[PDB]
Amino acid sequence: AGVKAYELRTKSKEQLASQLVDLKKELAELKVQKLSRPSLPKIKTVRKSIACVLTVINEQQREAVRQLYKGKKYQPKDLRAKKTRALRRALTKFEASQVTEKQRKKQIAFPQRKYAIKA
Amino acid sequence: AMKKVEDGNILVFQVSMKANKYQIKKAVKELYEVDVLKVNTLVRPNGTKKAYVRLTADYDALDIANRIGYI
Amino acid sequence: GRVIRNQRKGAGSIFTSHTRLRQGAAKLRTLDYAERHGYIRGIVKQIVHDSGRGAPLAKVVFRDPYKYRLREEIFIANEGVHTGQFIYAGKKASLNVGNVL
Amino acid sequence: GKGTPSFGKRHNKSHTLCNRCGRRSFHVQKKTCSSCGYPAAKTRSYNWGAKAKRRHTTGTGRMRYLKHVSRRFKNGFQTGSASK
Amino acid sequence: AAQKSFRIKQKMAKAKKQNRPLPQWIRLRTNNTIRYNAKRRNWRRTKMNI
RNA sequence: AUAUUGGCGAGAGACCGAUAGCGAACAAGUACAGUGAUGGAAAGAUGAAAAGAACUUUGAAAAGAGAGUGAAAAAGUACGUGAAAUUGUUGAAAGGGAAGGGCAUUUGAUCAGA
RNA sequence: GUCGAAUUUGGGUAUAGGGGCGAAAGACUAAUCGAACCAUCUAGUAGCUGGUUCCUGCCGAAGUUUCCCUCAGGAUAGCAG
RNA sequence: CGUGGAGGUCAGUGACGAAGCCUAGACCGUAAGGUCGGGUCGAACGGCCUCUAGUGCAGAUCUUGGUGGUAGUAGCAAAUAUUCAAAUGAGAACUUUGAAGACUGAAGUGGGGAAAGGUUCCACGUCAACAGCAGUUGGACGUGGGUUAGUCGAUCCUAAGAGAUGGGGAAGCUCCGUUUCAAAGGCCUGAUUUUAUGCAGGCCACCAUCGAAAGGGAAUCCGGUUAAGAUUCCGGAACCUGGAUAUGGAUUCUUCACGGUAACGUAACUGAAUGUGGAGACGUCGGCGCGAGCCCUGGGAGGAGUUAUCUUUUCUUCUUAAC
RNA sequence: GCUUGUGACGGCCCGUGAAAAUCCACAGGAAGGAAUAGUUUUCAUGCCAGGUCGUACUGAUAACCGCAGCAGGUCUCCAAG
RNA sequence: CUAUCUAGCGAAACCACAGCCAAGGGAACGGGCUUGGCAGAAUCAGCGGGGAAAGAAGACCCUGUUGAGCUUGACUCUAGU
RNA sequence: AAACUUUCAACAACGGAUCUCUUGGUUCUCGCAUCGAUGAAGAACGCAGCGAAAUGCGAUACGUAAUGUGAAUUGCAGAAUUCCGUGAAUCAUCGAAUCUUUGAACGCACAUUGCGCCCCUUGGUAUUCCAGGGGGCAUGCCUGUUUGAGCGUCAUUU
Ligand SMILES: [K+]
Ligand SMILES: [Mg+2]
Ligand SMILES: [Mg+2]
Ligand SMILES: [Mg+2]
Ligand SMILES: [Mg+2]
Ligand SMILES: [Mg+2]
Ligand SMILES: [Mg+2]
Ligand SMILES: [Mg+2]
Ligand SMILES: [Mg+2]
Ligand SMILES: [Mg+2]
Ligand SMILES: [Mg+2]
Ligand SMILES: [Mg+2]
Ligand SMILES: [Mg+2]
Ligand SMILES: [Mg+2]
Ligand SMILES: [Mg+2]
Ligand SMILES: [Mg+2]
Ligand SMILES: [Mg+2]
Ligand SMILES: [Mg+2]
Ligand SMILES: [Mg+2]
Ligand SMILES: [Mg+2]
Ligand SMILES: [Mg+2]
Ligand SMILES: [Mg+2]
Ligand SMILES: [Mg+2]
Ligand SMILES: [Mg+2]
Ligand SMILES: [Mg+2]
Ligand SMILES: [Mg+2]
Ligand SMILES: [Mg+2]
Ligand SMILES: [Mg+2]
Ligand SMILES: [Mg+2]
Ligand SMILES: [Mg+2]
Ligand SMILES: [Mg+2]
Ligand SMILES: [Mg+2]
Ligand SMILES: [Mg+2]
Ligand SMILES: [Mg+2]
Ligand SMILES: [Mg+2]
Ligand SMILES: [Mg+2]
Ligand SMILES: [Mg+2]
Ligand SMILES: [Mg+2]
Ligand SMILES: [Mg+2]
Ligand SMILES: [Mg+2]
Ligand SMILES: [Mg+2]
Ligand SMILES: [Mg+2]
Ligand SMILES: [Mg+2]
Ligand SMILES: [Mg+2]
Ligand SMILES: [Mg+2]
Ligand SMILES: [Mg+2]
Ligand SMILES: [Mg+2]
Ligand SMILES: [Mg+2]
Ligand SMILES: [Mg+2]
Ligand SMILES: [Mg+2]
Ligand SMILES: [Mg+2]
Ligand SMILES: [Mg+2]
Ligand SMILES: [Mg+2]
Ligand SMILES: [Mg+2]
Ligand SMILES: [Mg+2]
Ligand SMILES: [Mg+2]
Ligand SMILES: [Mg+2]
Ligand SMILES: [Mg+2]
Ligand SMILES: [Mg+2]
Ligand SMILES: [Mg+2]
Ligand SMILES: [Zn+2]
Numbered sequence A: 001a002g003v004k005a006y007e008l009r010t011k012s013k014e015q016l017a018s019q020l021v022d023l024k025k026e027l028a029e030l031k032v033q034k035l036s037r038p039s040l041p042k043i044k045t046v047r048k049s050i051a052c053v054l055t056v057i058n059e060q061q062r063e064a065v066r067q068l069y070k071g072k073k074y075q076p077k078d079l080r081a082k083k084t085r086a087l088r089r090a091l092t093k094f095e096a097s098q099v100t101e102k103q104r105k106k107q108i109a110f111p112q113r114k115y116a117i118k119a
Numbered sequence B: 001a002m003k004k005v006e007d008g009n010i011l012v013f014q015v016s017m018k019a020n021k022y023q024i025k026k027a028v029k030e031l032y033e034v035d036v037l038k039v040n041t042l043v044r045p046n047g048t049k050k051a052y053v054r055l056t057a058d059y060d061a062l063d064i065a066n067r068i069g070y071i
Numbered sequence C: 001g002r003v004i005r006n007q008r009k010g011a012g013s014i015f016t017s018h019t020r021l022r023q024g025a026a027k028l029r030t031l032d033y034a035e036r037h038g039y040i041r042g043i044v045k046q047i048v049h050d051s052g053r054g055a056p057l058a059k060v061v062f063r064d065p066y067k068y069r070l071r072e073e074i075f076i077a078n079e080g081v082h083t084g085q086f087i088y089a090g091k092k093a094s095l096n097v098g099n100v101l
Numbered sequence D: 001g002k003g004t005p006s007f008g009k010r011h012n013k014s015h016t017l018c019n020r021c022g023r024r025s026f027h028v029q030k031k032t033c034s035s036c037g038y039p040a041a042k043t044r045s046y047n048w049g050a051k052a053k054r055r056h057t058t059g060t061g062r063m064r065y066l067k068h069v070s071r072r073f074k075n076g077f078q079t080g081s082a083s084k
Numbered sequence E: 001a002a003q004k005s006f007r008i009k010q011k012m013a014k015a016k017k018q019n020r021p022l023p024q025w026i027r028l029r030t031n032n033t034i035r036y037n038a039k040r041r042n043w044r045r046t047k048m049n050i
Numbered sequence F: 001a002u003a004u005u006g007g008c009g010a011g012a013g014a015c016c017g018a019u020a021g022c023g024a025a026c027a028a029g030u031a032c033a034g035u036g037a038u039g040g041a042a043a044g045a046u047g048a049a050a051a052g053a054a055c056u057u058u059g060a061a062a063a064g065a066g067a068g069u070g071a072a073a074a075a076g077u078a079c080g081u082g083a084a085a086u087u088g089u090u091g092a093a094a095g096g097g098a099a100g101g102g103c104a105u106u107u108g109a110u111c112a113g114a
Numbered sequence G: 001g002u003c004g005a006a007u008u009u010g011g012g013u014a015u016a017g018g019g020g021c022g023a024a025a026g027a028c029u030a031a032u033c034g035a036a037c038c039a040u041c042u043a044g045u046a047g048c049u050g051g052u053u054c055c056u057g058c059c060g061a062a063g064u065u066u067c068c069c070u071c072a073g074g075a076u077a078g079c080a081g
Numbered sequence H: 001c002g003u004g005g006a007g008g009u010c011a012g013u014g015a016c017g018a019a020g021c022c023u024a025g026a027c028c029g030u031a032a033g034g035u036c037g038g039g040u041c042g043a044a045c046g047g048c049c050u051c052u053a054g055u056g057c058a059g060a061u062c063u064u065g066g067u068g069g070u071a072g073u074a075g076c077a078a079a080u081a082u083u084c085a086a087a088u089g090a091g092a093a094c095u096u097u098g099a100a101g102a103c104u105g106a107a108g109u110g111g112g113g114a115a116a117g118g119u120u121c122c123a124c125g126u127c128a129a130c131a132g133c134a135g136u137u138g139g140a141c142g143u144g145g146g147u148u149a150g151u152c153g154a155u156c157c158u159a160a161g162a163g164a165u166g167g168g169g170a171a172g173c174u175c176c177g178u179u180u181c182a183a184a185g186g187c188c189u190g191a192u193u194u195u196a197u198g199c200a201g202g203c204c205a206c207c208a209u210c211g212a213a214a215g216g217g218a219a220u221c222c223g224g225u226u227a228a229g230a231u232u233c234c235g236g237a238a239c240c241u242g243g244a245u246a247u248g249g250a251u252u253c254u255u256c257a258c259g260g261u262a263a264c265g266u267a268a269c270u271g272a273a274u275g276u277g278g279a280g281a282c283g284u285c286g287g288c289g290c291g292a293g294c295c296c297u298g299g300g301a302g303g304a305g306u307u308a309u310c311u312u313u314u315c316u317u318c319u320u321a322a323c
Numbered sequence I: 001g002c003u004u005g006u007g008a009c010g011g012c013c014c015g016u017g018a019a020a021a022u023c024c025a026c027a028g029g030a031a032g033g034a035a036u037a038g039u040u041u042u043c044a045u046g047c048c049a050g051g052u053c054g055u056a057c058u059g060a061u062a063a064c065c066g067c068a069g070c071a072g073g074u075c076u077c078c079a080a081g
Numbered sequence J: 001c002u003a004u005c006u007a008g009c010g011a012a013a014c015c016a017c018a019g020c021c022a023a024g025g026g027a028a029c030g031g032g033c034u035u036g037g038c039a040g041a042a043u044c045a046g047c048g049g050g051g052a053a054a055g056a057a058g059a060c061c062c063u064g065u066u067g068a069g070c071u072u073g074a075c076u077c078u079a080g081u
Numbered sequence K: 001a002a003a004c005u006u007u008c009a010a011c012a013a014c015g016g017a018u019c020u021c022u023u024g025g026u027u028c029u030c031g032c033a034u035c036g037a038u039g040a041a042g043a044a045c046g047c048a049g050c051g052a053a054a055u056g057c058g059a060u061a062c063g064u065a066a067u068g069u070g071a072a073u074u075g076c077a078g079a080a081u082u083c084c085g086u087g088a089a090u091c092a093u094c095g096a097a098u099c100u101u102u103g104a105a106c107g108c109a110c111a112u113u114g115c116g117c118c119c120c121u122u123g124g125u126a127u128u129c130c131a132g133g134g135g136g137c138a139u140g141c142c143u144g145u146u147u148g149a150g151c152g153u154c155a156u157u158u
Helices: A013-036 A042-068 A085-089 A101-109 B002-008 B021-032 B061-068 C005-011 C033-037 D050-056 D066-074 E006-017
Strands: B010-015 B036-043 B049-055 C040-048 C057-063 C070-076 C086-089
Touching: A013 A042, B002 B010, B002 B061, B010 B021, B010 B061, B021 B036, B021 B049, B021 B061, C057 C086
Parallel strands: none
Antiparallel strands: B010 B049, B036 B049, C040 C057, C040 C086, C057 C070
16 A cells, blocks of 8 residues: 555665665656556556655655764755744843843842731 | 557657656667667657667567566 | 927937037047147048038047057038148147148 | 727736746736735735735744644754654 | 647647546446536537637 | 725624525626726526436427326426416306496305304 | 828827916817716715605694894794603 | 614514515505505514614615616628529538639738737537627637757847946935946966965956847758647758767978969868957949749640630640759 | 839939848968878768747638628738630 | 518517597696587408607706816816926 | 518527525724744745646655544545554644755855855775765854054053
């Protein structure tokens, strides 16, 4: 019933490339057959198998690049997180929590006290 | 198209609308292991691309078509 | 209540000059060192008709004093100037018809 | 003339297809779309043309990315995977 | 014009491909309000205006 | 704390009920018109279920007449109900340059009350 | 009428609305011209024209006074409920 | 009095039939209206007390939709014109074939194209609608097929003009301006080959780009072929551009050729920067010369027509591309 | 003779009737250059490649515009007796 | 060639209701009302007396405290200079 | 007397009113804050066994991956029923991807599917020509880097 991504994920990139080529050959043969045969739906399964193999190949390649860029700043922009444009432009948590020395001193000296009226 | 295959030694392919004659020639050569004498192309009125690929005299287009599955 | 014809002329849409066939702006040589101090000799190559201008123009070729090349100038031909005539332009040029002094 | 005999001379297109909006409102000689304003950076629209704004506004296409923005916000713009 | 731009030819190709009646197996689907191709165009009736 | 005829998610109404309510309940900003800016409709309802009429017969055929399905065909996709204008047939009546109307009674038809 | 030059005409291009263009007719500017078309302001205002949807019962007018840039309108008094 | 909706109530009516609709059938009310029966029909609805309003139509050249009389009426009369037979078919004035009669009469009713259209082209099937009669036919309907390029165009060039940049104006949308008040440059290579590049010898610039399928412009013709494509396919025969290249030739011992008095000739016969010149490249009209194609015509070699008579006759084939 | 191409001329203008891409030539003389050999892809022959888009048909008393299968309008080439 | 008759096809204008007159009176020129004359189905081709026939909220004229085009030492301003 | 005309009824027409329906509109209230050069909104063209549209999607094309659910989808065809299963589905969810040609739209253009330049690589002897594949080349501005310009200017050798 087509390929399974969890099965493809156990294979090396060379095996995946070979399987992709075989699936493309099979799709070509199937669309040759389609001209004569009336209404064969097996083409859809091979198309989805090609899509699955391509997805797994891209997952492996992108994971490899993620490992290559792990930790260092300036990762590729398509590997960076896609929040909104405004969210990416917003101050980090470090910024916007920065306080001046005077402000830090006075907020340590006089924090909002906890109190209750008891009568 | 089948008459062209039989009599003119010309295979008729639907090809990518982005493919040029060089790409068609090299793809036919790689896919079917044949030498290509000439590639003529047109854009059909339905918006797909049709390539008349005349193989060299060394190869028989009817035999190639039989191999690749349409007689 | 309407913009009159002489007012409409200033926008220059259909009232621009028909300059296609013209030979180029008829001008003296640029005033340079040679003309300011001595003279320079050019040659009248052609006396041609300018479209839209009654006077004929004279194409006069001078040598470039600073680069090896010829510079063609479009003078307005004075009467009696002929092709193959030497024109002298500058402070030291002679008082002959066609000279620029 | 000026009626039926004059309508016979109509074979030169004042407008052709606009690359930006595809409306056949691209004035050939002005090189400007009468509908969307191409090649101006801004898209032409007017507050007196409320119906035209409604015709061309957001939501009249397929919103290839804006349609999922809201679900992504609802999930908080998470970045990992569902992790079985 | 017989010397047409590719853009024009692409539009004509799309128009040709969509110049067809309603598929007959539609009108058999479960609810199927669709009765006929209401967007059918013909060269003798309504011009594409490019 | 304030605004919010846009966006997203909700809950409602002494609101409208397909000529109403948004232009759009439907493949509606669609079809279509205009060179263009723009303009811009119409269009919901078989039945519980297609059970969407096998089969026979007449016809070149569309169809008809049967048969059949169905609670119903006085529901047959020209489909719920099915008004009026306007029309066919049937029946009744009257009719010398309109017709219609009022009061009264004759005649014909029809009918309640007791 | 004119028909070999102030000729006819295709295509390209320019001139855009109090603007253009006009061998001048207020002509032409997409069947629109003594100010195009489109949308909006805008349900513009109208002392003017038209219309204004059930029944019955009771009462029942005025076209006159004064003022008005008033004379096809209104205010005012009168008549009426 | 009547209508849509609302609170209350009649534990109101109803698939054993609500609502709606039709009904020269009945009853009540002066009336607005109300009630009943019969038919039709199929899912809701009503009485009373109150609440509420987008609440009552004959009109508005009202709005939308629908429908009449007019009325089987006006009419379907420009573009010379049709006819016979067969076939097909349910059906033929109109389709197809044959025959005949006509017309366009080469400034075409012929053969191609530009704009425009967009599949109308072609085949098969096919007639409900459309072709203001008809229809078996169709530019219709249904399904398919079809457009093949180094040489034809676009693409490139610039034209009138359009239009960024540098700048300036404008609150601004944007406007001006097109070489301007700008530090606006790639291409040669000494040398480098720590790398033919940076340092570094040295040559050229008063400027984006768009703008022509009739202007300019590298190069292809003939024959054949399809249902429908052809300067595109096939066969043959060429040519141009870009590139790579090795022979032969030529040239050199007087290194970069000889001959001719000359005009100039040639199979070649070094040539950077830079400069100069030419071609591209140009109106219109008139007569004259020449060419091509066509027209006319002689002989001959064929085929056809007329032949009571006449006619060594009437018609027709006899062609030769680019290179 | 008709159509057309072309040549040499002639008439006309207060009209003298595009531009650029591109190609060639010349001037110049930088430089590179021969003798068990050097020089020349402007001579001949030989090798390779030439992409992309358009290409059907009508072009009008029915394929365009005019609400339409409208006696209207719509540029041009060929052209027998 | 129509008109005409037939087969097929098949609109529109217009329409309060309609369609015989004379006189009378009447919004002072009636198809209707009054008084008379009269008056018999259903119709076809023509016709231009009448329907104060159709077409269009008279374009002339007046009114409106409705405009607009245009002009001028009108009133009030204004670009420019 | 028929025909004809007119009126009424029945049945049949025409037409689509009425009634009853209502996945729609309208208005009110409540909560929330999230478009885009990481390429948006919008456009064009495509993609299904059989679709013209709507809807979905992008050559991985009515979709791929992931997660959940737990047996469908359905007009036909086809497939499967092991379906006690990493597993149906036009399911839901959705965090990984793809995402043609465009578009603020970015090599230059664009009435052209027109024309360049750079890097890596492959083929055609091939650094130079041609072609295929992959990756690039907009503008304004900021910080920084590097290379520079100006007798603007300091010192120093002189
Ligand atoms: K006026
Ligand atoms: Mg081609
Ligand atoms: Mg000028
Ligand atoms: Mg006009
Ligand atoms: Mg124009
Ligand atoms: Mg509605
Ligand atoms: Mg209704
Ligand atoms: Mg218009
Ligand atoms: Mg209905
Ligand atoms: Mg029933
Ligand atoms: Mg019914
Ligand atoms: Mg009736
Ligand atoms: Mg006058
Ligand atoms: Mg009002
Ligand atoms: Mg009284
Ligand atoms: Mg009055
Ligand atoms: Mg209401
Ligand atoms: Mg009932
Ligand atoms: Mg009745
Ligand atoms: Mg029901
Ligand atoms: Mg009301
Ligand atoms: Mg009414
Ligand atoms: Mg009334
Ligand atoms: Mg009316
Ligand atoms: Mg009406
Ligand atoms: Mg008649
Ligand atoms: Mg007539
Ligand atoms: Mg005739
Ligand atoms: Mg015949
Ligand atoms: Mg004649
Ligand atoms: Mg004749
Ligand atoms: Mg045909
Ligand atoms: Mg007919
Ligand atoms: Mg018929
Ligand atoms: Mg038949
Ligand atoms: Mg067809
Ligand atoms: Mg060419
Ligand atoms: Mg500008
Ligand atoms: Mg260009
Ligand atoms: Mg040309
Ligand atoms: Mg042909
Ligand atoms: Mg060939
Ligand atoms: Mg020699
Ligand atoms: Mg000629
Ligand atoms: Mg052709
Ligand atoms: Mg043709
Ligand atoms: Mg023709
Ligand atoms: Mg037409
Ligand atoms: Mg009388
Ligand atoms: Mg009188
Ligand atoms: Mg009368
Ligand atoms: Mg009487
Ligand atoms: Mg009578
Ligand atoms: Mg008459
Ligand atoms: Mg009369
Ligand atoms: Mg009036
Ligand atoms: Mg009037
Ligand atoms: Mg007054
Ligand atoms: Mg005024
Ligand atoms: Mg994208
Ligand atoms: Zn646009």
